[PDB]
Amino acid sequence: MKIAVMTDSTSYLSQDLIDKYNIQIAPLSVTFDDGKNFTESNEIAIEEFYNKMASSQTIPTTSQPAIGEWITKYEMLRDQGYTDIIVICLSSGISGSYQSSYQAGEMVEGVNVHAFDSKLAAMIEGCYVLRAIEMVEEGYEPQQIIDDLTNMREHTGAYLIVDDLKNLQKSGRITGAQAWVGTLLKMKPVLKFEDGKIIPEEKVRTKKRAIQTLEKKVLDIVKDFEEVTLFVINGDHFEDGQALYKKLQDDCPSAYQVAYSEFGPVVAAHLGSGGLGLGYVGRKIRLT
Ligand SMILES: CCCCCCCCCCCCCC(=O)O
């Protein structure tokens, strides 16, 4: 038995970790109104993506990996000698990536594919990859890993803010948010993931109070966990995520793991400018 762990690009793992563990990635893409298509990777300058989105008369669209991209990656790993492939996917509630990766796995001969629905995105999805890799090194078998990731999923989540719901409304990735869209004053929406979908949580009077609300909501949840990893997941306002990261480092005991990450282009296209997430996992994830 020889187990590989792979993922799609929206896990937004650092290039350092992708390099160290040779993590294969099925990339998603974003298409601009001028017909320019860009596949996700860590060579794309995120600042350049935000500049093009700002200069776009129409919001860019995104695309999951094609089923043939999964198949090509599975065939490559099989032919290097892997017998089993763990696949960590973006939430099935917001993308067809997961179901595609499962159907691709059914079609590929000579290798076992174990597709896993993270029910989240960004480095929270990425934590499932890092957990799976750790378990493979410890000698676990694929079904034990899948069982452990399924348990991890029960104590994982995220809250987030955006400047405006127009990007999420345009793509249909905000669930049950009709009355707020285009009806906000200074008030800022706080959103959260629930069972793989993005739903409203609270409306707050200002952005600064919304960032305070992210911290309060998450700290109230994770105080009941035996282990805690928090991720600040920042969008285009560097100082917003950096401020929250530093405040978490002050407010939290060192027994909590507190880390910083950023959204890539595909998630940015759906959030728009001003996105900022606080994610949590009730595990001590190996981040090195
Ligand atoms: C804190 C994590 C926040 C993640 C925000 C995710 C916003 C929705 C992204 C949807 C990507 C769909 C990709 C596709 O299938 O085309």
Could you provide a short overview of the structure?
The protein has about 290 residues and is an alpha/beta fold. It has 2 domains: about 1-155, Rossmann fold (3-Layer(aba) Sandwich); about 155-288, no CATH class. It is about 40% helix and about 25% strand.
Could you please describe the fold and organization of this structure?
With 288 residues, this protein is an alpha/beta fold. Helix content is 39%, strand content 24%. It has a six-stranded mixed beta sheet, with helices on both faces. Strands 2-1-6-7 form a four-stranded parallel beta sheet, sandwiched between helices. It has a three-stranded antiparallel beta sheet with strand order 4-3-5, covered by helices on one side. Helix 3 crosses helix 4 (97-107) and helix 5 packs antiparallel against helix 6. Myristic acid binds at residues 28, 62-64, 94-97, 121-122, 158, 160, 173, 233, 266-267, 270-271, 277, 279. InterPro entries: DegV, DegV_C, DegV_domain_contain. Pfam families: DegV (PF02645). This is DegV domain-containing protein. May bind long-chain fatty acids, such as palmitate, and may play a role in lipid transport or fatty acid metabolism.
Name the descriptors.
alpha/beta; Rossmann fold; four-stranded parallel beta sheet; 10 helices; 13 strands; transferase
